[PDB]
Structure formats: C-alpha cells, structure tokens
Amino acid sequence: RSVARMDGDVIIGALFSVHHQPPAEKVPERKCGEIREQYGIQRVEAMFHTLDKINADPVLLPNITLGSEIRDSCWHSSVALEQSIEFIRDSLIKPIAGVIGPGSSSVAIQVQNLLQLFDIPQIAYSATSIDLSDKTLYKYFLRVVPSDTLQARAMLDIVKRYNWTYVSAVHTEGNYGESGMDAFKELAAQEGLCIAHSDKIYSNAGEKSFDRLLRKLRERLPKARVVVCFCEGMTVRGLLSAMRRLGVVGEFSLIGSDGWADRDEVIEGYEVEANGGITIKLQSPEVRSFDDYFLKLRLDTNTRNPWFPEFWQHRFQCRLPGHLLENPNFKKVCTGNESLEENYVQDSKMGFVINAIYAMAHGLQNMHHALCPGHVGLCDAMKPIDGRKLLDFLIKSSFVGVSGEEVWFDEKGDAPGRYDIMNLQYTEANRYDYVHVGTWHEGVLNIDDYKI
Amino acid sequence: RSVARMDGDVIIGALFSVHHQPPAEKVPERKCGEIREQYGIQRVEAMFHTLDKINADPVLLPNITLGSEIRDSCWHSSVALEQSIEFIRDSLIKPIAGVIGPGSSSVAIQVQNLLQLFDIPQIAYSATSIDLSDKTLYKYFLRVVPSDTLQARAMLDIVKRYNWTYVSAVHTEGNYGESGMDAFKELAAQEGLCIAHSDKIYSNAGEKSFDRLLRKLRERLPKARVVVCFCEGMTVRGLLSAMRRLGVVGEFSLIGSDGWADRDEVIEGYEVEANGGITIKLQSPEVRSFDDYFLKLRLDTNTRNPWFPEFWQHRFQCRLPGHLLENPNFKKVCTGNESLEENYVQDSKMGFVINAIYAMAHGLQNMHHALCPGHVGLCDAMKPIDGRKLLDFLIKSSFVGVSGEEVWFDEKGDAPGRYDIMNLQYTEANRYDYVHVGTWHEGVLNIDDYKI
Numbered sequence: 004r005s006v007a008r009m010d011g012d013v014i015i016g017a018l019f020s021v022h023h024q025p026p027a028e029k030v031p032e033r034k035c036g037e038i039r040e041q042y043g044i045q046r047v048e049a050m051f052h053t054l055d056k057i058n059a060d061p062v063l064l065p066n067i068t069l070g071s072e073i074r075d076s077c078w079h080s081s082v083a084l085e086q087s088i089e090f091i092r093d094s095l096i097k098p099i100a101g102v103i104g105p106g107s108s109s110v111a112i113q114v115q116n117l118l119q120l121f122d123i124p125q126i127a128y129s130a131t132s133i134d135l136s137d138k139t140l141y142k143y144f145l146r147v148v149p150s151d152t153l154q155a156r157a158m159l160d161i162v163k164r165y166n167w168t169y170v171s172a173v174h175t176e177g178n179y180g181e182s183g184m185d186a187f188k189e190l191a192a193q194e195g196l197c198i199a200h201s202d203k204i205y206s207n208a209g210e211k212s213f214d215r216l217l218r219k220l221r222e223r224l225p226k227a228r229v230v231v232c233f234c235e236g237m238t239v240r241g242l243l244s245a246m247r248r249l250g251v252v253g254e255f256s257l258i259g260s261d262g263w264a265d266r267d268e269v270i271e272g273y274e275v276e277a278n279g280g281i282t283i284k285l286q287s288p289e290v291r292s293f294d295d296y297f298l299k300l301r302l303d304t305n306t307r308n309p310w311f312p313e314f315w316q317h318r319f320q321c322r323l324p325g326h327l328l329e330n331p332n333f334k335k336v337c338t339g340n341e342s343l344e345e346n347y348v349q350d351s352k353m354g355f356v357i358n359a360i361y362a363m364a365h366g367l368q369n370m371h372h373a374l375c376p377g378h379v380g381l382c383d384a385m386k387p388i389d390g391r392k393l394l395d396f397l398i399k400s401s402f403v404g405v406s407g408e409e410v411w412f413d414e415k416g417d418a419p420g421r422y423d424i425m426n427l428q429y430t431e432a433n434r435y436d437y438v439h440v441g442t443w444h445e446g447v448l449n450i451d452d453y454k455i
Numbered sequence: 456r457s458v459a460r461m462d463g464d465v466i467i468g469a470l471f472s473v474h475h476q477p478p479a480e481k482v483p484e485r486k487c488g489e490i491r492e493q494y495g496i497q498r499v500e501a502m503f504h505t506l507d508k509i510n511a512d513p514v515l516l517p518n519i520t521l522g523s524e525i526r527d528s529c530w531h532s533s534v535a536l537e538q539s540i541e542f543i544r545d546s547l548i549k550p551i552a553g554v555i556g557p558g559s560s561s562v563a564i565q566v567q568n569l570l571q572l573f574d575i576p577q578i579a580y581s582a583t584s585i586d587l588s589d590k591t592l593y594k595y596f597l598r599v600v601p602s603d604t605l606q607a608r609a610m611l612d613i614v615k616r617y618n619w620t621y622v623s624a625v626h627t628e629g630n631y632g633e634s635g636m637d638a639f640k641e642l643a644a645q646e647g648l649c650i651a652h653s654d655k656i657y658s659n660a661g662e663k664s665f666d667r668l669l670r671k672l673r674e675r676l677p678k679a680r681v682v683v684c685f686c687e688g689m690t691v692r693g694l695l696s697a698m699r700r701l702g703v704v705g706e707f708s709l710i711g712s713d714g715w716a717d718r719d720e721v722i723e724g725y726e727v728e729a730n731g732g733i734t735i736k737l738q739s740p741e742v743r744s745f746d747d748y749f750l751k752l753r754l755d756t757n758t759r760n761p762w763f764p765e766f767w768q769h770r771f772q773c774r775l776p777g778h779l780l781e782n783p784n785f786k787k788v789c790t791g792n793e794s795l796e797e798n799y800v801q802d803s804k805m806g807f808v809i810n811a812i813y814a815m816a817h818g819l820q821n822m823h824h825a826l827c828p829g830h831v832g833l834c835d836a837m838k839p840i841d842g843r844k845l846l847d848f849l850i851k852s853s854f855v856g857v858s859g860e861e862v863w864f865d866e867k868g869d870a871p872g873r874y875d876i877m878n879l880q881y882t883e884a885n886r887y888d889y890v891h892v893g894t895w896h897e898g899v900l901n902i903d904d905y906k907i
C-alpha cells in the first residue's frame with residue numbers, strides 16, 4: 004500500500020483518507036475502495052503545501068526543515084491501525100515525532116490507543132466525539148476542533164434567545180447522537196427547560212419506524228413544536244420523508260446538530276418540509292493560499308503524491324497509455340491538459356487540517372526554544388525527540404490560525420468552540436439554500452434577526 | 456535482540472524476562488541488564504520442554520505439532536511492547552496464535568492493550584493485579600492465577616478465624632497495594648470490622664517516613680495491634696527496621712500479602728521484630744519432569760536457546776575462547792563441564808508457566824474438535840486461526856494441571872484461588888523459619904491450630 008513522504012529533520016506523520024473504506028467482505032484482506040479527492044488527494048496535497056510554507060518561513064522553525072510521512076487511512080480502523088503500526092515500529096527502530104489525523108472519531112480512538120503505548124502525540128481535525136476529552140483514557144490525543152459538548156451548549160443557547168420554554172428531542176443511535184443529547188438534556192434541567200417528547204432511531208431503520216416516530220412527535224402539540232435534533236444527516240432526511248408520506252408539512256421548527264449542517268444531500272427533494280430549520284455547522288473559513296496551489300498542479304510536476312496519477316484518471320475519467328497506474332473503466336485519453344477547476348470544490352474542513360499541522364510545528368518550535376537555548380538547529384537534547392515532553396509543549400502552545408482564528412488547547416486537548424448558525428430558506432432568487440445568519444464565539448450567541 | 460524460536464503447525468508466542476530491565480537512563484535506547492536464570496533461561500527452557508512433551512503426547516493435539524516464538528521482555532513495558540509489535544506485525548503479514556506472559560502485571564496490562572487491537576489472546580501466570588478482571592477494558596486477557604481480590608478475601612478470612620474485632624491497615628503505593636487494600640476495606644464494613652489506623656508509603660521512602668509510620672501505628676494501642684499489611688516486600692522489611700531503630704520489638708502481629716510471602720530477603724537480619732507474622736503465599740508445587748530436563752542441558756546440545764551461551768558464562772563466571780558471546784568480566788575458562796546442579800533452585804512459579812502453556816494447547820485442542828470434526832490435521836476453517844474464536848474455546852477450556860491441580864477460568868478469565876498460609880516461627884531446631892501452617896482452597900480456610 005503506497006505511501007506519501009517528504010524528507011526533513013523532524014518528520015510529522017499523517018493519516019488522511021486517500022481511498023474509500025473496504026467493502027463489507029473485503030475487510031479481512033484489507034482492500035480499500037476507490038480513491039477520493041475531497042477527503043483525500045486534497046488532504047494529502049495540503050500537507051505538502053502547508054509544509055512548504057512553514058519550511059520557507061523565516062520566523063517559525065528557522066533552520067529546522069520539516070518533513071512528513073502520509074499514510075492512507077481508508078477511513079477504517081483496521082487499515083488505520085495497520086499503518087499506525089509501521090509508524091511506531093519504523094520509529095521504535097528517521098522516527099515519527101507526531102501524527103495528524105485520522106478523520107473519523109470512532110477511528111481516532113482506535114488509533115490513540117495504539118499511539119499512547121509509544122508516547123506519540125496525535126492531533127486531529129474532525130474527530131469531535133465527547134470521549135476524547137477523557138485524558139485518563141486518551142492522554143496523548145488533542146484536536147483543533149471543539150468537542151460536541153459545545154454543540155449542545157450552542158443549540159441550547161439558541162433555544163434560549165427565542166424564549167421557547169418547551170421543546171422536543173430526537174437523537175440518532177451511536178456514540179454521537181446519544182452523547183450529544185444526554186449532554187443537552189443535562190443543560191436542560193440546570194437551565195430550566197422541559198422536554199415534551201423524546202425518541203431515538205438508527206439512520207437505516209425502516210420507513211415504518213420513521214412514520215411511528217413522526218406520529219409520537221405530532222401527538223404532542225401545540226406545545227412540543229420545537230424539535231431539537233442532535234441527528235445524523237440521514238436521520239433528519241428520513242424525518243422529512245415521514246412528513247411527505249403523511250402529507251403534512253410545516254408543523255415543527257427543526258434545530259439539528261452538525262450532522263445536518265448545510266449538507267445539500269440531506270434535503271434534496273424535501274426542500275419543503277425542511278425549510279425553516281436551523282443547523283449548527285463547524286465554522287471553517289475558506290483558504291485561498293490552497294487553491295492557487297492545488298489547481299495549478301500538473302501531472303508531470305507532482306512527483307511527491309504517488310496517488311495523483313490514479314486520482315487524475317478517476318477525476319477526469321480517462322486513461323494513460325500503458326502506465327503502471329492505468330484504469331480499466333475508461334476509454335478516452337487524458338490530454339494531460341484538463342483543468343482541475345471544473346466542478347471544483349474545496350474541502351469543507353481544510354482550515355482545520357492546515358491548522359492541526361501548524362499546531363504541530365508550534366509544538367516543536369516552542370520545544371526547541373526551551374530545550375535548545377542558543378542552539379541554531381536541533382540540539383542533542385532533541386535527538387531523539389522525547390514524546391511525553393513534546394506533548395506538554397503542544398498543549399501549552401498557542402498561535403494565530405491560517406485564516407486568522409485563535410488557536411489553543413485546554414487541559415484535556417480540546418479546542419475552543421466556534422460554529423456557524425445555518426438557516427435553510429428560500430433566497431430572494433429562486434432556490435432553497437442554506438443561508439449563513441448567525442455565529443457562536445464561545446458562549447456569545449449572535450444572529451441577524453433580520454435574516455430569519 | 457535475539458529470539459528463541461521452535462517450529463510447528465501452530466506457533467505460540469511468549470514474553471519471558473530473559474534479562475533484567477534497562478537501567479534508569481538506558482530506557483531510551485532500550486538496552487537491558489544482565490541475564491537471569493530464575494525468571495529467564497528456566498522460563499524459556501521450560502517452554503521447549505513442555506512443548507516437547509505435548510508434541511510427543513498421543514491424546515492432546517494428535518497430528519498438529521506445536522511451535523513457538525519466545526521473545527525477551529526485560530521485565531519492562533518498553534521492550535515488551537517493542538517485541539509485542541514484531542508479534543502482531545509478523546502476523547498481520549507463520550503468525551502467532553497466542554501469547555504467554557509477560558511477568559509483571561504493570562506490564563501485562565500494557566501488552567494487553569497492544570494485543571487486543573489485533574484480537575490476540577494473552578494468557579498470564581504471575582500477573583495478579585485486580586484491574587485485569589475488567590473485560591470491558593482487558594477483554595483478551597486471562598491468567599492461570601487468582602487475582603489479588605482473593606488475597607484480601609483470604610487474609611480477612613484469617614482475621615475472622617481469630618475473632619479479632621479491631622485491626623490496623625498498611626499498604627504500599629501502586630496499582631498493587633492500593634487496589635488490594637481497598638478490596639479488603641470493602642470486605643471490612645460488609646463483614647463487620649473496624650480499622651483503627653491506616654497509612655501508605657512507597658518502598659523507597661526515607662527511613663524517616665518509616666519511623667513516622669511506626670509512630671502513627673504505635674500510638675494506637677492496645678487495640679490497634681493486628682496490622683493488616685497488603686505490602687510490597689521491601690515495605691515490610693522497612694517496617695521491621697523502623698522497629699529495630701526504635702528499639703521496640705513485638706508490639707504487633709503482622710499479616711502480610713504475598714508481596715512478603717516467604718521471601719528470605721525480606722526478614723534477613725530482622726528475624727526478630729518479624730517473627731510471629733503470617734503471610735499468604737501462592738500455592739505452586741514443585742515439578743520434577745523439568746529438573747531431569749534442565750540440569751542435563753549441555754553447552755553444545757542446546758541449539759534452540761540462542762541465549763544459553765551468554766547465560767552459561769554468567770552462571771559459572773568463566774568465558775569462552777573467542778566466542779561471539781564472550782564476557783569481559785571473567786578470566787578463567789569454562790570447562791564446559793560444570794554441573795548446573797550447584798546452588799540450583801527451581802523457579803518458584805514454574806508450575807504456573809507450564810500450565811499457562813498447557814491451557815494454551817487445550818484451547819486449541821478444543822477449537823479443533825469443534826471446527827474440524829473428523830479432520831486429522833488443521834482443516835481449512837483454522838487456516839488461518841481466528842483469534843476471537845480461540846478466545847471462547849480457551850475460556851471454556853478445563854483440564855488437569857501438570858502437578859494434578861484443577862484448572863479452569865470463570866467468565867472474566869480469572870483462575871480459582873489457592874494459597875498457602877505461612878507463619879514465621881522458631882523451629883524446634885535452632886532457627887527462625889517460615890512454617891507451612893494452613894491452606895486456602897477457594898473460601899475454605901484450613902489451619903493446624905496446633906502448629907501456631
């Protein structure tokens with residue numbers, strides 16, 4: 004299984020999802036799925052870029068090149084682990100100083116277990132689950148994204164502003180939905196709120212179960228109107244379906260967690276029984292520096308991304324004349340000229356990534372200053388680099404985000420919360436779209452009442 | 456780092472302590488200490504033997520040779536993990552079916568985390584800590600030795616027989632002492648007992664801290680006389696010194712956990728302020744079959760124990776003429792004739808080891824019978840060997856011990872308890888010695904009142 008890699012004085016490891024996960028029965032032999040641009044090639048190319056930017060920089064790590072080892076996680080604990088092994092062992096015998104990723108929280112956990120056995124700092128960028136806050140269990144983990152605790156807090160803070168003294172509650176099964184809700188309900192009593200009805204359900208349960216859900220919900224009115232949905236995307240979708248089936252439309256005000264966010268694939272077709280709701284989404288600004296880089300990527304200049312070729316073909320559905328990385332699903336030829344701009348969309352979570360890395364540099368920068376006073380490069384004290392220590396440095400590290408955000412960690416490795424309040428409405432144009440209306444900057448709730 | 460290995464159809468892994476742990480500052484580069492006979496070469500040599508006996512047996516695993524991979528643990532989490540890696544990796548790509556050891560509980564925990572990530576069964580023999588009973592955390596662990604929970608139980612049961620309605624309590628710092636005590640204290644209330652005083656202390660704390668401890672203890676009399684010592688050996692020794700210093704002798708009746716047991720190096724010199732106490736010690740009978748084998752080990756015939764040579768030198772303090780494994784600490788020459796019988800002592804925990812192994816075979820035998828009915832060797836269903844399943848079979852396994860004991864595991868992988876009750880007294884001869892007075896066969900307390 005191929006592996007991205009750049010050389011340097013201090014090597015940072017990374018676990019991005021280059022391909023899709025292995026199908027059901029392919030889990031044993033560990034064969035992954037088709038390549039991914041979104042959660043993959045872009046994540047990878049990003050590393051490199053960010054690394055070039057840091058290394059070229061004259062303030063941060065002056066005379067200490069930064070290198071990296073990028074392995075494919077395949078968004079599955081099994082592969083992620085397989086790789087993670089190579090990481091530690093190559094190390095136990097140039098060694099890894101730290102790891103970025105993996106994406107999924109369920110995974111990140113698995114990875115953290117295998118990583119703390121060798122005292123290796125793991126910074127994440129999308130794994131928000133509420134367990135990763137228990138250091139007594141996940142000591143070496145830390146992320147640049149708020150946990151989901153801060154999700155309930157912000158959703159509640161929303162219900163507060165609109166003086167609603169009576170709501171409903173629905174959540175999906177799994178360590179995501181359960182933890183979040185329980186978290187909210189906890190904020191219910193203490194704050195002074197009453198929960199009319201409440202239920203749960205998997206995202207795959209039959210349409211029947213859904214209808215049943217709607218029923219139990221409707222029966223509680225005209226009091227239980229506001230439905231707090233710490234729900235996975237597909238669960239909300241399934242609810243709207245339940246309304247379209249029962250021919251009823253607009254009987255509640257939805258308020259969903261980020262599982263819903265602004266995902267266009269959750270309301271397609273039901274842009275009606277949905278309209279009006281409010282979604283909480285992780286506030287992650289765009290990033291220009293990265294487009295100017297990526298888009299101008301050529302097929303013969305990208306020599307560090309062993310994947311690119313495979314990807315380039317899948318991305319443009321064409322094949323290369325007798326190339327070790329040729330695809331059998333295409334017939335035409337790649338002019339090696341097609342422009343990556345077409346139908347281009349920047350990974351929603353980019354910012355976090357770049358930052359997670361940058362937080363990994365600063366950890367070192369700050370370690371150097373302390374254990375190598377007067378030294379220009381890496382002093383004996385950091386050869387090798389002590390795991391446990393780099394950890395402190397990391398935590399007690401603070402800096403300016405790549406987009407201008409404030410970055411730091413609490414005592415558990417948790418980052419400050421900062422979301423966006425999305426509202427799905429009919430634009431003055433001619434389409435139902437998610438419109439940015441409010442923000443959440445750490446307990447401070449803002450909303451342009453004139454936008455809702 | 457060398458590795459003992461024997462070939463076969465199913466390979467069993469093992470983590471014995473061949474050398475001592477790495478010094479304080481040598482922990483980074485992971486260099487261990489001098490070789491060990493007691494906890495090492497004999498443990499290893501044992502493997503081979505036991506394996507030879509099973510393989511030669513006509514009843515157990517018929518036409519399925521058993522092989523093994525023995526790696527040095529150096530009684531330290533760090534090396535043990537390093538090796539544990541090789542195990543899984545060599546496997547993720549002949550693989551290991553299971554793991555025997557490591558020695559220390561503190562370590563076996565560590566090793567258990569890295570081993571359940573790859574569904575690999577670990578059977579222990581000396582790791583009694585009370586945590587290893589939590590499967591929601593250490594699912595893949597199991598041992599042939601009672602936990603320490605049954606230590607308090609049996610210690611209390613002792614205090615019971617002597618109707619004492621008022622005792623004292625002292626315990627050493629560490630997952631050993633704390634958990635044991637608490638465990639006892641838990642049995643205090645429910646049963647109806649009161650604890651006069653109570654304190655704790657590291658085994659290295661200054662003589663001062665010790666004196667202070669004796670003080671706090673003496674001050675509580677003539678009621679707080681019976682001192683329940685769930686203590687590490689050196690802690691007890693330390694107390695006896697505190698008494699010799701303060702010139703006081705015989706003011707309390709000690710009752711110590713196995714940390715003390717019948718260790719001669721705990722009371723040497725203080726054979727006075729110690730006499731009278733009672734220790735709980737693990738019932739592990741001798742084993743002849745192993746002596747007949749070990750003692751007849753020659754330097755040119757032992758080809759599977761890559762260590763032997765090194766060991767042979769340190770064991771007789773002599774060196775071999777220009778040998779890749781020559782020691783610089785000796786001057787004479789090994790006649791290669793010296794008899795291993797001199798000053799020979801059989802590993803006190805032997806029985807357990809052998810049995811751990813035998814319980815590793817019985818797990819497989821039992822798996823074979825079920826998933827390969829009628830097949831003679833290893834049927835397709837066992838190639839490769841599914842970890843998870845080997846687990847069930849193991850647990851649900853039962854058998855006759857190597858010395859005639861009964862062996863089985865409960866629902867959490869715990870083995871039945873069975874200790875000996877030691878009493879330090881002055882034999883009718885002329886010496887203070889530990890005398891076997893009573894037993895503890897699972898809740899049934901026996902003592903020859905005429906021996907105490």
Ligand SMILES: C[C@@](N)(C(=O)O)c1ccc(C(=O)O)cc1
Binds near residue numbers: 106107108109130132
């Ligand atoms: C459920 C999730 N909040 C978690 O497990 O942390 C999660 C959601 C979406 C994504 C994603 O598609 O990027 C990843 C993770």
Ligand SMILES: C[C@@](N)(C(=O)O)c1ccc(C(=O)O)cc1
Binds near residue numbers: 558559560581583584
């Ligand atoms: C700390 C210990 N009580 C445990 O981990 O259970 C322990 C102590 C000594 C030994 C030994 O050397 O035999 C084994 C284990």
